[PDB]
Design a binder for this molecule. Sequence first.
Ligand SMILES: Cc1cc2nc3c(=O)[nH]c(=O)nc-3n(C[C@H](O)[C@H](O)[C@H](O)COP(=O)(O)OP(=O)(O)OC[C@H]3O[C@@H](n4cnc5c(N)ncnc54)[C@H](O)[C@@H]3O)c2cc1C
Ligand SMILES: Cc1cc2nc3c(=O)[nH]c(=O)nc-3n(C[C@H](O)[C@H](O)[C@H](O)COP(=O)(O)OP(=O)(O)OC[C@H]3O[C@@H](n4cnc5c(N)ncnc54)[C@H](O)[C@@H]3O)c2cc1C
Ligand SMILES: CCOCc1nc2c(N)nc3ccccc3c2[nH]1
Ligand SMILES: CCOCc1nc2c(N)nc3ccccc3c2[nH]1
Ligand SMILES: CCOCc1nc2c(N)nc3ccccc3c2[nH]1
Ligand SMILES: CCOCc1nc2c(N)nc3ccccc3c2[nH]1
Ligand SMILES: [Zn+2]
Ligand SMILES: [Zn+2]
Lengths: 228, 228
Amino acid sequence: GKKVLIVYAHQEPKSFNGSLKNVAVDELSRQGCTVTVSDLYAMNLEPRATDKDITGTLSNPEVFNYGVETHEAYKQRSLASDITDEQKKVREADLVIFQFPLYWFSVPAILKGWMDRVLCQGFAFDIPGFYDSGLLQGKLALLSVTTGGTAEMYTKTGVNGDSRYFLWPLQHGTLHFCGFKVLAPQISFAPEIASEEERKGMVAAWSQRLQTIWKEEPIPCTAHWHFG
Amino acid sequence: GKKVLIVYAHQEPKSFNGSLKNVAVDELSRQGCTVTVSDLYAMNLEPRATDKDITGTLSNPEVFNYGVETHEAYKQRSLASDITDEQKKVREADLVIFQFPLYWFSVPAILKGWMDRVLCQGFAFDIPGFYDSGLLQGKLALLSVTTGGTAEMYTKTGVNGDSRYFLWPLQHGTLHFCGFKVLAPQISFAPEIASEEERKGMVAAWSQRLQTIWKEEPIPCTAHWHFG
Ligand SMILES: Cc1cc2nc3c(=O)[nH]c(=O)nc-3n(C[C@H](O)[C@H](O)[C@H](O)COP(=O)(O)OP(=O)(O)OC[C@H]3O[C@@H](n4cnc5c(N)ncnc54)[C@H](O)[C@@H]3O)c2cc1C
Ligand SMILES: Cc1cc2nc3c(=O)[nH]c(=O)nc-3n(C[C@H](O)[C@H](O)[C@H](O)COP(=O)(O)OP(=O)(O)OC[C@H]3O[C@@H](n4cnc5c(N)ncnc54)[C@H](O)[C@@H]3O)c2cc1C
Ligand SMILES: CCOCc1nc2c(N)nc3ccccc3c2[nH]1
Ligand SMILES: CCOCc1nc2c(N)nc3ccccc3c2[nH]1
Ligand SMILES: CCOCc1nc2c(N)nc3ccccc3c2[nH]1
Ligand SMILES: CCOCc1nc2c(N)nc3ccccc3c2[nH]1
Ligand SMILES: [Zn+2]
Ligand SMILES: [Zn+2]
């Protein structure tokens, strides 16, 4: 009995992202998986890292250091309930899927805020306690990304460079850092300019992959994998 | 007579980031430059890309497309005043400095929100009108970033990889994409770990650099610069 968390960052349910989220819920639900979706825009998730994220007495209330105070708050069980609720979902999940459109070679800010605020020290990593020793070891993560740019644009000789170049901060710097094993990304290139037929194929391809997702091995989340 | 915008993303004015911000304002003010600072946390800048960013009625209110609607809103002069206020500051600036702590190999979410919402189609880029032909072409941009990790950890052979790897989505995918010429990053490594005197050295180096900032050549913002 596998538990999946989908962290979803799109404003419109009828979007191509909305369709990819829905196809994931349907397929994983049909398999008998336990599925939870954090729909960040519908939640109006707070993206800003502020002192409101700590509900206890600050370690140093004169000079506010977000990393220090959230770490201490996590240990004192005194983080904001929105953070606490996301952490519970992550803690229960065997797989965390991130579904989002690429914004400036990265995640939309609302999803960046999820990362910034949820993956706090003591919960997702410690020092020491990162990369292969990260605290979310034993979990899988998968980026399901849609782009404006075509696949040709995301090659070493295209204007945007290899897609693996933009994956590094997310897959390695964030997910691997917290101990996740990373499944190969699902990149759906340029749905806005693809044909109706081609769009259905990309949605179908995602649905089909998910049928066998539990038998995939993660990528080796290495510099070598990303950069050759 | 040069104009500088500092986009600043730190919660605490007594922080090392706060100090680097103040040194920049002091030095550029002393030179006679026109200086403006967008203090994103003090402004409580909205980071989420939503339909509240378009004033009045939408192009397609049935199916919301953030990209399409903000492009149209830019042409119709119906973007939210927080966005248009930032665009005015960027339009006038000859140099834009971003001052921030590294969050998950990237910018803090509030600054990511600035990038997502301010740099809209029609203002920062168009088709055609990207990379060297971006709509902000000729302007200079500079990332002044502080890290938790030390310089020796941000090497090709270290666990984190070269610091240049994480600069790619920001310098290339964002700044170069909009036509900015990118000055070399100012990376202030591990101020929390560094000695008092080391920190003073890092502040003094930034102050020194700013004295001759207008004499600098930009970097070749290429895949080879970042990964070669
Ligand atoms: C602020 C910002 C920054 C950006 N930065 C970047 C960047 O750095 N790099 C980059 O490449 N791109 C970038 N983009 C572009 C962005 O990544 C794309 O616009 C996005 O990925 C498109 O996904 P979508 O779900 O919005 O597409 P949609 O517009 O929702 O999808 C296109 C069409 O597919 C249709 N569709 C939906 N479901 C289905 C289905 N089941 N079957 C068939 N058709 C369907 C929809 O009706 C729609 O008409 C950026 C966009 C913004 C707003
Ligand atoms: C959500 C999150 C994600 C992060 N992700 C990453 C990551 O991916 N990679 C990474 O490397 N790091 C990461 N970090 C760590 C973060 O980058 C550092 O904590 C940050 O850059 C430190 O900068 P600061 O300004 O907060 O330092 P501060 O703690 O404000 O400064 C350190 C010391 O400098 C002192 N100081 C201030 N001004 C001066 C002055 N003029 N002269 C001398 N001393 C002075 C202060 O008093 C303080 O003692 C992350 C942190 C968070 C919260
Ligand atoms: C009345 C039908 O409205 C469109 C819709 N289709 C789906 C779906 N296949 N799957 C879904 C899974 C989770 C949440 C929503 C959906 C969904 N919504
Ligand atoms: C026979 C109808 O086939 C299409 C289909 N629609 C949905 C749906 N709205 N929601 C679903 C939720 C869970 C699992 C499957 C679906 C689903 N399947
Ligand atoms: C025409 C409607 O606009 C969609 C779009 N926005 C972006 C962007 N900021 N950046 C991009 C970078 C590379 C390729 C495509 C994009 C892109 N596409
Ligand atoms: C220690 C291993 O590599 C460098 C590094 N230092 C920090 C830090 N002080 N704090 C962090 C907070 C969140 C995410 C990463 C870091 C981080 N990364
Ligand atoms: Zn890795
Ligand atoms: Zn470039």
